[PDB]
């Protein structure tokens, strides 16, 4: 199925295409495999498109929300998370 | 009772015929020579302008249609309860040469305020200009942006007789004058305050609309602006702002482009910031003397200023042989409204000793103060402490004399100003031929 | 290595300053002209009242840029690779310094100008929100004035810099201004007449190339026409309104932004910068009456009927130049070598063959020869610039070179503020009565 989707894409942070957005409205596993197939066949534009969609699912969300949504265990101590939060605030506009 | 446009339409044909006869009978009369040093010195002393509104009397000061400052203070109509002349009344005098009645001035004020609503695109651009764009630049930008409303430009494009130019020029000028207080106060609120403005009072006069929109309801401030806007309205046609507006207007540019160009000349540091330069000098003096305004202390400072080679700003003119009546009119306003104001006490103490000190030094032709030596302190009293905005106020006033002359020039069909230029090399060749044919 | 424009001018201007000082010291009292009463009432026609170094009109050979005719600069000035047209940047070097730049100096000056071409955010925002019915010349002056926030001269003056350093900041402001003019003019063209979408500046393209490309054309022949247009319109003495206005405003130490904006408002006058549009409208009226019949008898028929009806043939007839304007012949050769079969040029060419003879037999025209404005519209019409209301903007993009060159020269030599004397008609009568009686 992934090979079929890749050929569809060939037939049809730079901005993402809306046709590619509908093309990547599939489930998370299929989205993972599409990125894998583009990386394997050196289809870099399709690779970047799949990454940007994943990035939008992550962007602006808290660490806890990302861990639940993407199934990741927290191995940080509470003080380590606070120090990282301050570092990330240094990267913000203020 | 006749309006301003009706009365002017009856006066300008007389002036037009008088000029036509004068040039026909005396046109070949020589009035001056052009020396090489003059064309290389800014045309100083060359009579190259016909400005009907005002002439400088060497002993009585500026004369508006022959009337001195004392004359216009006595004869011009005033607002109800005020002893100060109205700038609208002086505009009537500048354009017609006659003193209007009380009802005629009030109807002219109502006509101006009825033309005071700014178009949406002008309010939009003013609200989007950055605060570090100088107020004078925002002033001429807003005036230029009104060109889309020019009745003269539209009439000229459609095709109108030359004898009808003045009519559309008159309407453009009054449409423009009515919006100048709104534009000026919009810039003041946007740059220096919170950008919030009041609404135009349809029954308020020109200066009162400016003060209220700036954000003050003090009637003494309103009276100050009435005096300020009146006495700065016009001062001959040789100055850069007046000459520029006449020059641009002679090419049949609308009053919007003529005033905007005149304002850009007024923005020049050598032209429109004399009262700010006085204010800086007063503040530096006030710091050195630590607010000791005694006769001995001030005289010592003035002598040190002159002996070091520097001048006393506001004092010293090349023509007027007495004190500027505009200065005395501002001194009187301060005496009657805030005689204890510390900054006025400093200005007054300078007035009492500077002519005597400058005389003993003996290097100043006429050691007397002009209008700029006193205007700054009066503005400082009511909260207008931003010196960069003072040239905008000067423009709101000077636009009266500028537009009066522009309407007159279009009525008499004044010609385009087109002198001749040469390079320095061609001036050398020209001088050699003149001197060889002695 | 190769000196830059600023470095070379820094070596040249002190020599010109010493030359002017000794010339005025030795011959300053030499009378060079008279001022008759008819002249002060006739726009100072024939009065020498301007020192303009860039260009002088030769009554026999046409306009001369630093002594070079149109044919001279077409031979002497550097050109872009593959082109035979002079570059306006190269003429700007000639106007300012008086010398011919090298091919690498021009390419470096073009790169420096394009490096300064980025419009500030508030200027882009301002232009995009101006209404389409606001005339492009008004939008042009507005955008130039809005750049006053970037003026290095105004900031340096507020810091109290020495008078001997004025020219340096005037120079930098002029180059910052020149670099942004193609972007401003093209942005206005895209917003008013197209879809408002504009490209980016190529840092290696020249002045006229970036103008054409940003307008929306990649045709290199169009680029060659713009190189010729912007070159031949760069300067034409200092008596004309636009040049005189910018010098007058600049003499009060206003920045190049306010000086050029005032000069642009004068160029927007119907009696100054609309000759191109006038010729084109008269040509389209002729084309419709004859229906593509450009026979000599049919054209001569139309010319005699027009002259008998009192109307003039626009573009033909000059008061000084005794032959055909070389700027006209340069544009005529361009059309012959690029589109000799263009229908509108065939009409222009047939008028060039007939109109001088028709006007000579009518006898009411001194020099019945065409000028530059009789040939510029057809060339612009060929490449898609058919919106005539934009033509004066192109004139301003070109004339700014001569305006800013003289302004830089004025500040380097410390030119004084232009302040002539004015009088009212009443006082002029008294002045004449005293002269004639004596």
């Amino acid at each position: 199925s992934v090979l079929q989707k890749v050929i569809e894409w060939a037939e049809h942070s730079a901005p993402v295409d809306s046709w590619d957005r509908e093309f990547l409205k599939v489930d998370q596993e299929m989205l993972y495999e599409i990125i894998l197939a583009a990386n394997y066949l050196n289809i870099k534009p399709l690779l970047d498109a799949g990454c940007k969609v994943v990035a939008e699912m992550i962007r602006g969300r808290s660490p806890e929300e990302i861990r639940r949504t993407f199934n990741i265990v927290n191995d940080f101590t509470p003080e380590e998370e606070a120090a990282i939060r301050r570092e990330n605030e240094w990267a913000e506009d203020r | 009772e006749k309006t301003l446009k009706e009365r002017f339409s009856e006066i300008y044909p007389i002036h037009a015929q008088d000029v036509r006869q004068f040039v026909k009978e005396h046109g070949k009369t020589k009035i001056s020579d052009v020396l090489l040093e003059q064309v290389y010195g800014g045309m100083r002393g060359i009579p190259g302008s016909v400005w009907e509104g005002s002439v400088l009397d060497p002993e009585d000061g500026i004369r508006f249609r022959g009337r001195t400052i004392a004359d216009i203070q006595k004869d011009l109509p005033k607002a109800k309860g005020s002893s100060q002349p109205l700038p609208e009344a002086l505009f009537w005098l500048l354009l017609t040469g006659e003193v209007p009645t009380q009802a005629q001035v009030e109807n002219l004020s109502a006509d101006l305020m009825s033309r005071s609503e700014l178009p949406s695109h002008v309010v939009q651009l003013l609200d989007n200009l950055p605060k570090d764009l100088h107020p004078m630049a925002q002033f001429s930008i807003a005036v230029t942006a009104l060109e889309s409303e020019s009745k003269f430009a539209k009439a000229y494009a459609q095709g109108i007789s030359k004898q009808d130019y003045w009519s559309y020029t008159f309407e453009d000028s009054l449409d423009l004058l009515g919006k100048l207080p709104v534009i000026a106060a919009k810039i003041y609120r946007n740059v220096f305050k919170d950008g919030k403005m009041g609404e135009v009072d349809p029954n308020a006069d020109y200066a009162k609309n400016l003060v209220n929109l700036i954000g003050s309801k003090d009637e003494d401030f309103v009276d100050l602006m009435r005096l300020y806007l009146t006495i700065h309205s016009d001062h001959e046609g040789g100055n850069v702002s007046a000459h520029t507006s006449h020059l641009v207007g002679s090419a049949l540019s609308s009053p919007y482009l003529s005033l905007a160009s005149g304002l850009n000349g007024l923005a020049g540091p050598l032209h429109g910031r004399a009262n700010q330069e006085v204010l800086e000098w007063l503040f530096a003096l006030k710091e050195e003397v630590n607010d000791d305004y005694s006769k001995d202390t001030i005289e010592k400072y003035l002598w040190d200023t002159l002996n070091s080679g520097r001048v006393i700003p506001g004092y010293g003119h090349a023509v007027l042989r007495k004190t500027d009546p505009r200065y005395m009119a501002q001194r009187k306003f301060a005496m009657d409204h805030f005689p204890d104001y510390e900054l006025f006490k400093l200005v007054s103490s300078i007035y009492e000793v500077a002519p005597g000190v400058l005389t003993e030094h003996g290097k100043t032709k006429n050691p007397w103060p002009n209008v700029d030596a006193h205007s700054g302190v009066l503005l400082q009293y009511y909260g207008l402490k931003e010196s960069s905005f003072y040239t905008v106020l000067f423009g709101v006033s000077r636009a009266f004399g500028i537009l009066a002359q522009l309407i007159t020039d279009r009525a008499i069909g004044a010609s385009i100003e087109r002198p001749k230029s040469y390079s320095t090399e061609k001036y050398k060749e020209l001088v050699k031929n003149i001197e060889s044919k002695l | 290595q190769e000196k830059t424009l600023k470095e070379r001018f820094s070596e040249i201007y002190p020599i010109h300053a010493q030359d002017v000082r000794q010339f005025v010291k030795e011959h300053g009292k030499t009378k060079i002209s008279d001022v008759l009463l008819e002249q002060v009432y006739g726009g100072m026609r024939g009065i020498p009242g301007s020192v303009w170094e860039g260009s002088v009109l030769d009554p026999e050979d046409g306009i001369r840029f630093r002594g070079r005719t149109i044919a001279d600069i077409q031979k002497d000035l550097p050109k872009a690779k593959g082109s035979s047209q002079p570059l306006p940047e190269a003429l700007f070097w000639l106007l300012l310094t008086g010398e011919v730049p090298t091919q690498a100096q021009v390419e470096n000056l073009s790169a420096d100008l394009m490096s300064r071409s980025e419009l500030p955010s508030h200027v882009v925002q301002l232009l995009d929100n101006l209404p389409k019915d606001l005339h492009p010349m008004a939008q042009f002056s507005i955008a130039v004035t809005a750049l006053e926030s970037e003026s290095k001269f105004a900031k340096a003056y507020a810091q109290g810099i020495s008078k001997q350093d004025y020219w340096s900041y005037t120079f930098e402001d002029s180059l910052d201004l020149l670099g942004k003019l193609p972007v401003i003019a093209a942005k206005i063209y895209r917003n008013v007449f197209k879809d408002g979408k504009m490209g980016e500046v190529d840092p290696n393209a020249d002045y006229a190339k970036n103008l054409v490309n940003l307008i929306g054309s990649k045709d290199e022949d169009f680029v060659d026409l713009m190189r010729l247009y912007l070159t031949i319109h760069s300067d034409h003495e200092g008596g004309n309104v636009s040049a005189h206005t910018s010098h007058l405003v600049g003499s009060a130490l206003s920045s190049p932004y306010l000086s050029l904006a005032s000069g642009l408002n004068g160029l927007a006058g119907p009696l100054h910068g609309r000759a191109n549009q006038e010729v084109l409208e008269w040509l389209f009226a002729l084309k419709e009456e004859v229906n593509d019949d450009y026979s000599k008898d049919t054209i001569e028929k139309y010319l005699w009927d027009t002259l008998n009806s009192g109307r003039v043939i626009p573009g033909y007839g000059h008061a000084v130049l005794r032959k055909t304007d070389p700027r006209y012949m340069a544009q005529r050769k361009f059309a012959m070598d690029h589109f000799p079969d263009y229908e509108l040029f065939k009409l222009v060419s047939s008028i060039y063959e007939v109109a001088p003879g028709v006007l000579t037999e009518h006898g009411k025209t001194k020099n019945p020869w065409p000028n530059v404005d009789a040939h510029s519209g057809v060339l612009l019409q060929y490449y898609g610039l058919k919106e005539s209301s934009f033509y004066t903007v192109l004139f301003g993009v070109s004339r700014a070179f001569g305006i800013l060159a003289q302004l830089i020269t004025d500040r380097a030599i410390g030119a004084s503020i232009e302040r002539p004397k004015s009088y009212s008609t009443e006082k002029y009568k008294e002045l004449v009565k005293n002269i004639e009686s004596k």
């Binding site: 990125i35 992550i58 993407f70 120090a83 240094w90 | 931003e386 960069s388 | 810091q159």
Partner: protein, 338 residues
């Protein structure tokens, strides 16, 4: 399924889009993020480059000054030793555990403190900062502003601010240029306080192509402040020059100046360890790149708290929002922009 079963190369691309979110997820992404900026730093300034040799101790002292805020995050990487001649760069404490902060410290010019602040024309200050050679060609994404810090005793002495001239240029190279605000900026100051005034942005000082193929990454930026007030306002400490920074405060809300309470000490604005790093870095660059002598003596430069700023905004329609200002993170902390 999980995000962790994706290849490492895909994770690195995800880190190019959402680095700050991912680096807070688990130790894996934090360490991979630190490694990513190790590669960015060393591909820019190789391990054998002279810059690491001359800035090592001063750079470590700057990073160490951040420990009260980030020590628990820095100590996630444990195999580090104190900086020394025999400790490799990839094992150096305050560097190998801080590549994200080290990289940003080298990519932007640090603050410049006026060390003579508490002592016709008169020089108020002359100092240095390190400037990336390509600051101009990256101005769209990363403009380099020039901000000046003054103590102003009252609104009336503020009128002398446009008469303090800021002169900038490459140390012993090229012409000097002047950066300045509008001449009437003082008229927007209405009370005593400490003011940060924006003087615009760093102008183009040279053509970058003359540094192509020369291996130069940083230049010494020399700053000189001149008292041209023709008064005693600086001699009487009524107008005190505190220093300069190049921080783009509040990019989303363009401003002309902002005020903080004058009771705050100079350490509330300037990190001495950062200024010492930038100063000595620039000094070492001047000694390595030019034979000419530096025209001024080598100076010795030696707890972030919430300080509310009241801005005068550049756009008239931008209104005040005090609640937002109270909630924002501190502004006297490092600005990580890349």
């Amino acid at each position: 399924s999980s995000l962790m079963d994706l290849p490492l190369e895909i994770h690195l691309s995800l880190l190019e889009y959402v680095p700050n979110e991912l680096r807070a997820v688990n130790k894996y992404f934090y360490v991979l993020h630190n490694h990513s900026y190790k590669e960015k730093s060393l591909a820019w300034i190789a391990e054998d480059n002279y810059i690491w040799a001359v800035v090592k101790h001063s750079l470590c002292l700057y990073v160490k000054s951040l420990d009260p805020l980030r020590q628990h995050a820095r100590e996630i990487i444990q195999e580090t030793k104190e900086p020394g001649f025999n400790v490799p760069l990839c094992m150096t404490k305050y560097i190998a555990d801080s590549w994200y902060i080290v990289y940003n410290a080298l990519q932007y010019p640090g603050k410049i403190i006026n060390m003579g602040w508490d002592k016709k024309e008169r020089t108020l200050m002359q100092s240095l900062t390190a400037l990336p050679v390509n600051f101009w060609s990256r101005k769209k994404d990363e403009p380099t502003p020039v901000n000046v810090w003054f103590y102003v005793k009252n609104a009336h002495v503020a009128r002398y601010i446009p008469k303090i001239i800021t002169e900038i240029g490459i140390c012993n190279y090229g012409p000097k240029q002047i950066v300045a605000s509008a001449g009437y900026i003082n008229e927007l100051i209405t009370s005593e306080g400490i003011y940060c005034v924006n003087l615009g942005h760093l102008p183009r000082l040279y053509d970058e192509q003359i540094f192509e193929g020369t291996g130069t990454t940083h230049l010494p930026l020399e700053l000189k402040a001149i008292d041209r007030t023709d008064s005693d306002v600086c001699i009487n400490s009524d107008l005190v020059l505190l220093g300069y920074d190049f921080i783009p405060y509040q990019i989303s809300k363009p401003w002309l100046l902002f005020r903080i309470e004058p009771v705050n000490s100079i350490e509330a604005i300037f990190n001495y360890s950062e200024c010492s790093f930038s100063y000595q870095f620039a000094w070492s660059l001047a000694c390595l790149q030019s034979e000419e002598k530096i025209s001024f003596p080598r100076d010795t430069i030696i707890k972030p708290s919430k300080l509310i700023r009241i801005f005068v905004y550049k756009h008239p329609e931008q209104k005040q929002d005090l609640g937002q200002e109270i909630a924002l993170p501190n502004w006297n902390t490092p600005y990580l922009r890349r």
